[PDB]
From TrEMBL, chain C:
Gene that encodes it: hlyA
Residues that span the membrane, as ranges: none
Name of the protein this chain belongs to: Cytolysin VCC
Amino acid sequence: TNTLPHVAFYISVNRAISDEECTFNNSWLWKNEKGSRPFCKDANISLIYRVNLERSLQYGIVGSATPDAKIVRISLDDDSTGAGIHLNDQLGYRQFGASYTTLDAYFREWSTDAIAQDYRFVFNASNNKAQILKTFPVDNINEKFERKEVSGFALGVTGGVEVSGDGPKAKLEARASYTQSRWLTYNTQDYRIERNAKNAQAVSFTWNRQQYATAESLLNRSTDALWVNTYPVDVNRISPLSYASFVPKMDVIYKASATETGSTDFIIDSSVNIRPIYNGAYKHYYVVGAHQFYHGFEDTPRRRITKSASFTVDWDHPVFTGGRPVNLQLASFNNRCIQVDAQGRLAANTCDSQQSAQSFIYDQLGRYVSASNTKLCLDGEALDALQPCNQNLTQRWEWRKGTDELTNVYSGESLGHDKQTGELGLYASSNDAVSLRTITAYTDVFNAQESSPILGYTQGKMNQQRVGQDHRLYVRAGAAIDALGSASDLLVGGNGGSLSSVDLSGVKSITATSGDFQYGGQQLVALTFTYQDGRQQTVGSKAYVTNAHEDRFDLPAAAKITQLKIWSDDWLVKGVQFDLN
Amino acid sequence: RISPLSYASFVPKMDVIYKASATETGSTDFIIDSSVNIRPIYNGAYKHYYVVGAHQFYHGFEDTPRRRITKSASFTVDWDHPVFTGGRPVNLQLASFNNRCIQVDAQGRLAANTCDSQQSAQSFIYDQLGRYVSASNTKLCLDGEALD
Amino acid sequence: FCKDANISLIYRVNLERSLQYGIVGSATPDAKIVRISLDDDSTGAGIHL
Amino acid sequence: VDNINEKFERKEVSGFALGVTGGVEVSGDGPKAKLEARASYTQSRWLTY
Amino acid sequence: TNTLPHVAFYISVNRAISDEECTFNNSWLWKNEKGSRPFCKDANISLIYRVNLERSLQYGIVGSATPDAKIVRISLDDDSTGAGIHLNDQLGYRQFGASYTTLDAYFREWSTDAIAQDYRFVFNASNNKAQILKTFPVDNINEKFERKEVSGFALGVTGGVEVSGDGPKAKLEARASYTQSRWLTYNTQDYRIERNAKNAQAVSFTWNRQQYATAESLLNRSTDALWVNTYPVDVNRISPLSYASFVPKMDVIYKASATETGSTDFIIDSSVNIRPIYNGAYKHYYVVGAHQFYHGFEDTPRRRITKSASFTVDWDHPVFTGGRPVNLQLASFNNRCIQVDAQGRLAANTCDSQQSAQSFIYDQLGRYVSASNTKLCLDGEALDALQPCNQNLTQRWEWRKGTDELTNVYSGESLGHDKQTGELGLYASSNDAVSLRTITAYTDVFNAQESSPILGYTQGKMNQQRVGQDHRLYVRAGAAIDALGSASDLLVGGNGGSLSSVDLSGVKSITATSGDFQYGGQQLVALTFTYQDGRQQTVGSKAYVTNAHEDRFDLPAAAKITQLKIWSDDWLVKGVQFDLN
């Protein structure tokens, strides 16, 4: 128990990708003539972040080289990976010859499987109370370079003789050649590392294509004659890493000030920018013959497909104290541990393994401190309540070996408790109605709060609104979803929606669907509260939606939902979360 | 041909250690100054026309100015602060009372008062010689001849 | 010429003696030490243009 | 500690070549024959860092 | 205390470099036609060395690997750096054209910032008693080599056929070629490491320009016609290390013989050689035209700028005993430690932590040895004084555990002392007038003697002249500082300077100016004593010096100076050092 405590867990992130999101038009230059098609089969998103939270030091220690602070560790490496990111399993193409009888134009075209341009992840906190401490990919490397310089001069002499009937000839020749050149070489990676930071709250890692960075760079050859028909798109210059499957690596650590108090959320953006390839051939003609000059068409759009996640730190959580706590039990009963309210009065009640208000901290000074409040502490002057604690010696307590009682320093007076009321008093010796038996032990209060999955997008204003006493989510949404709130006044965003009030308690689940919502951009396309009986209350559109994605988000029934987290612009909501019990 | 390290994001790495003399006293500040020099790139084409034709000769006008945007901070050290003493101080509790610790003034008189975890003048240093010394100053230390 | 330029660095400040109190004849001569460090363990966000 | 002093790289090469060629041209106007020799020498300096 | 003790401390050398020292003419070939200007900007010298010193082995240990001797280490490394060496904070030049109309000569020239040709460090000992044990720059580098060799032979055949209206032609050829060549390859450094140990008392380390050793190695072009007017000197071929800031690194250790007794001084000398660049272009006005053959005039003078310091070792000092000492307290009193004089008689006095004559050494033989006198040991036969050490058991002593009495083996009886006089005796039992309380502990005596800074130049004849008992010195100085001493017969230097006699008792400071003395040489140019009052006595003249370096050397009040460390040769006076107490 003398080691550094921790609180850590794993967080999943998973998203299937249906065909339509991957579907693009067939050819580029002839964009609309041949129509569209899927460009990747069975694309998948799966990954497991590692979340860890700690105090930078054991409680009570003084002047260690490590400065006092609170540390947040969001990371993955070998130890924890998840499955990964996937686009394709093979490399399928499709040829398209001359649409018409061509005179001079791009005439032979090929459209093959899509390839990943780049991968990206964005981490940021809900507020500015915490700052980035440090991050594994310290920073892209100031590349090594080599420069070579070559200078030389030639001095040649040639003795030649020709012999023939007309007349012999002789030759003496001198050649003086001077030459200089420079060489500059370096190294590149398949996918370049690139970190970008927006601010002391928002940071982004990214991996982008560096080698063969453009489609036309993948040309398997240079060119050919006018008539040569051959599939000119190599694959062997493509790492299967680039398209098939991939797993990232990342370490980020946020700092938190010792004196800070409150709570905050942390926000996770995983994204991949998908793009097909488009290589064509213009029959570049010189008057005699021609050549299917090939040139990549990189103007074809790229769709960034993303998923988001988040979680919550409550800084006042006991773990940040820096000392493994224990309970305190009136051993006369079979189950009576000391609990503390918010105000300061103390009770003896049922014992809980996860009761902070029943948790306590032992120190070098022999005091005892609330995990819920480092301020108040135990003192024998008035056991009815605890006080903001300091060097008052009467706060201090000592164990007597082989006993079941704890003693006070001030005058050796022992601690006692009546067999009925759970009172705490100080006495010289136990009486008939007061027992001294009292034992403690370490307990877990550090299992993290369960994850709350998000639905939509982590863009637009972040707003937490307490679920109203009226237990009815009020919405400005009709066929389009503009604004949300706990009441008709707590809207943020647009106004064009209809006025709706939805029951929140007694709800079995929420089927919330987002995606390509016709009213503009990617947003929560519809809400459908599946109540306790299973009945549906629907606001939004399930018919103006394409590329939809839905969640049937489930709770214990009749759960008193507590807060509403919206990610929403002054027009529409594109992110919804229900901060749980 | 440009790394992101030039424009997008960067982090530095360095270490400095300032030396201070044996027992020089008083106060001092240390000053940190961060600066980045910003400058765009201006490149154009020069019409070098030989009588046959003109080639667009490209030249980057490196004479474009620069702006060194800076920020700064500072902090303070007091040598007499117990940090440079070299030992872990402790209080002295007049254990008859619930809260009394002995404290030293500037002149030398010693008073029993409420305690403070963060009171230099209530803190003291233990040594190999079995003496007890003012954590505020190595020059002052306790003796039983005149405890006042 | 650049959107959202930002500066945010963090620095580690250390203060220490070169030796335990009263120790004699060690390797390191007595002095006072100010340490300003910026490396792996403590860097902060960085510089953006 | 310091601005880096680095390690330069220097190559220097002296070369000399000796070639001999014997050719014959044949045509209607008349056969001709040539025998010739070449002697080349050159210094080369290389620097890398 | 079981660890081997040490004595170590930091010594700072600091020297400002005023503008005039870095001032030179505005051109080389045109000495005065453009005048002069400064070539530096706040050039500075600031280093700190770490001087340690220690016995080669703990006292009493016998037959170990390392033979007994004394060690003085002087180090400049990772944790012993200083600030550095500074010349400039920018890259600068200055165009200059044809002073007069030219026919065929150099006509275009460029002034440049001054560049460190080399850095040097001189390590010296005031006599031969010590020796140069070892040096971290073990030695100059036996540098490896690469030697390729190539032999080649060519065997080509060729069939060439021409066809035209004149007549078909055919030809066949055979080429036989042979060639041989050699390749040599090796590596250099910017400022090559070169050490020169001049002799068994003095060593020199140096880092000198090796790559690009000439200004002509800085060209960017062979030559051109009149069309070019370009400052032809690159700066990128110059490291920032070359000119702006530099920090050295090296380590030296001096050996000292076991049996020697006495005292000695050690001398640290730092130096740079400064030199600007003077490269120009000769317009070789041939019939071909004007070709500006560039040339670097490596003949431009080079000025060495130096600073120095020194310090003092006393072999007789207790540090080299090899065992941490303790005191001896007649604990009847509150402040009474036993002190030993030079002759042997003993006293009881107040206790100083730093008092050698109260310090003592305790060995396996249970003896006690004076730190200042390794020859002497306490013996119970006669406690009035110590005796030369031997195997006499009565010299030996033993502690009684858990007690305060240190007793003697011979017959076992204890050491005693009367409560009044501090006498020592041997007694079987304590009496009324004799106390037995006797305690000790380790006491620091290992602080270093403070450093006496130096002014002038550490060259010329070195000598020591004990300050006359009158505490008043005699000089032959006039318009020039010729000879110095503590008496008219004790002059070192010439004799041309006029007679002078200046009091030394009660002097607070000296305004001493040295450097390029106008009338002759680079030495101590003038002195002005400043008594405890603050008045001035002048010898030499501040007006009769060029490029003066002036300093205000200051002392603790009314310090009885003991001797003069003087460096003068027999012509003038080169340096000064008044031994402080």
